[PDB]
From Swiss-Prot, chains A, B:
Inducing or repressing factors: By amino acid starvation.
One Gene Ontology term, aspect cellular component: cytosol
Function: Seems to act in concert with SspA in the regulation of several proteins during exponential and stationary-phase growth. The exact function of SspB is not yet known.
Keywords: Stress response
Protein name, per record: Stringent starvation protein B
Organism phylogeny: Bacteria, Pseudomonadati, Pseudomonadota, Gammaproteobacteria, Enterobacterales
Whole-protein residues included: 5 to 111 of 165
């Protein structure tokens, strides 16, 4: 009945990480549908994308999707990750962050 | 280690609740140092403060403290609650929300 909270938590942890001068990495499960990522880096069914302001462009941490574009292997790429497919957000350095609990809306 | 995330979590749930058209209330510990709330309404050490945009003014959910203006008992009052004293946030209509985990920075 109520919307999922995952995108809001993702935004808060993202900011939190940035304020602690950390490099946020999004952990995505590329097995799910709608996931548009550079599969060449996916391994064991999941991919870890650096989403720091520096490393990416046009970042939109929306409720429906996490979108952005960046160059991989020298090729411009447009990335789209349904929130359903967002596993966790960790800092590359320390590891601080969180794994998102499953939610009814993402079934 | 790192700074506390409660402020960011507080902001996210606050956003999440309003987006679901719910009424967010704070649950404050009036026992801690620096808490500035209209004590007349505190009950057994805690005060439930409605923080919806209407029932409040100049709401500031900063990292250090929650500040806002409101009138309690016909008299205009300034509320100020150090993040350390915020126990939980929740929707008055369905109890949706969360109680914050204790964090190091607040000992």
């Amino acid at each position: 009945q109520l919307t999922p909270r995952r995108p809001y938590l993702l935004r808060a942890f993202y900011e939190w990480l940035l304020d602690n001068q950390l490099t946020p990495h999004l952990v995505v499960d590329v097995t799910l549908p709608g996931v548009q990522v550079p599969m060449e880096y996916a391994r064991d069914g999941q991919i870890v994308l650096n989403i720091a302001p520096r490393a990416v462009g046009n970042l939109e941490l929306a409720n429906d999707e996490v979108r952005f574009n960046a160059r991989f292997g020298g090729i411009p790429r447009q990335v789209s990750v349904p929130l359903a497919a967002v596993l966790a957000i960790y800092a590359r350095e320390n590891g601080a962050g969180t794994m998102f609990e499953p939610e009814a809306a993402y079934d």
